[PDB]
Amino acid sequence: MSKVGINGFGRIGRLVLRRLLEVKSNIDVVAINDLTSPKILAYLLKHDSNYGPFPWSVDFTEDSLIVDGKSIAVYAEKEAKNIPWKAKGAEIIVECTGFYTSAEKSQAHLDAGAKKVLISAPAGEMKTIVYNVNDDTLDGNDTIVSVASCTTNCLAPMAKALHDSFGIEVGTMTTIAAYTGTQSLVDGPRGKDLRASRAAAENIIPHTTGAAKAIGLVIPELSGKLKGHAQRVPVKTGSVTELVSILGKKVTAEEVNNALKQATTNNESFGYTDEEIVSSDIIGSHFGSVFDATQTEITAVGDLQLVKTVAWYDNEYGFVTQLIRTLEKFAKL
Template identity: 60%
Template sequence: LLKYDTMQGRFTGEVEVVDGGFRVNGKEVKSFNEPDASKLPWNDLNIDVVLECTGFYTDKDKAQAHIEAGAKKVLISAPATGDLKTIVFNTNHQELDGSETVVSGASCTTNSLAPVAKVLNDDFGLVEGLMTTIHAYTGDQNTQDAPHRKGDKRRARAAAENIIPNSTGAAKAIGKVIPEIDGKLDGGAQRVPVATGSLTELTVVLEKQDVTVEQVNEAMKNASNESFGYTEDEIVSSDVVGMT
């Protein structure tokens, strides 16, 4: 699965299994099977940063287990609860001062929404808005009709055959990233039959009057950077796969 990926394509480097893990392009990577993060050998391995991508340690107290195991920092690749910062790169990463031990990198939808909302608020003033994410199906949905592990009757349906209404926490989480617009956005999600490649629609009321499409597009273009792209090409969802 490290070498062959249905969505992202084949990894062209060398991957081989070795004792205690695997080797990628000559560099050994250790592998562990330990359900208790506090028992992982981060101290022995002199680990600086743990990327917490399991989905189980998504609050500060739980993620602290990695610190107890010897890691210096933890970055949670999901929305998180507790007294910790939620950071979207190139939107509010300047808030980090180096003293943080656990930080949330927010959800994929919040990473999509935040840069756009920031530009609109900074340049035109955002009064209120409604966002909808047209989202690829995810691992918490069924691939065929069957009882869902959380009892959700919609996510119980075949993901690749249905448009499935769902909730999203991105509209509320945006307040953790951009406090000035906290409580100004609401929204929902539609899970659609594509395996990867999603979009976020944002409809807003602006403080500034008579704002034109050209002004908004120019503002987005000027704000574009290595993590926030801008294009006028007539692309589709598959065209963004592999860009991040």
């Protein structure tokens, strides 16, 4: 089975390898590109503030990591076209740096000798997969594909089930979400976004997201029907997405919950809970999204009805399990 390279050995990139080893994937990770020394990547891989000690041995040499006894070449090329993917035969690149989020930009990996790129972020108008929502749209001719955001992977399965069961006419979402590396530790410049410049562990911070606006790449029938944003708050990982919808039918809360429960049955990407969990309970989830029946709310006056549905997601590990499900299929094609 296919050989993989990881560009960007960050929060997502390191967890990609963790999850591939955890599921004993036949994918062989043969090369990693980042901006730093093997010694430092080894330290970051062995010790994780969110998920604890790495479950396999980690060592490094001057130019590689040794993970569970197996060598992974380490490169440090800030420009992707300079990465020597052919040296170890990396055919599929998991693109996790944040800096190649377009077909034009990730073309650099194919120029550098790879066959396919899976981008761990929204990447404009390209094929965009939420596993177990629209992964059947992948085919053998795709070369550059996106798995959208963590938030998309949370929102899409819930929106899909509601639309399939009842029709979504229009809706808006807010995700209350763990802070990430795009934000700031102390108040200081963070590119052009003013709110991103503010101390992330000390604030509720409004944040734009494209999860709702671009949902049509994943669920074409919902194109233009959703908007949304984020409130970034001081938890280290673990997030929750609220969606307020007008549906195509009057419903009860039990009816909505029953429809979602059916959508999560035999569904390794989309979980269900009716337990009164909190964000730390989603840390380490193996789902991309967990619908929370306890938070469903129907507000009605006359023939006007608003439906609020809520799903949790581990924006790090849970999303990564979706990235890996997509990678395994992308690599078989």
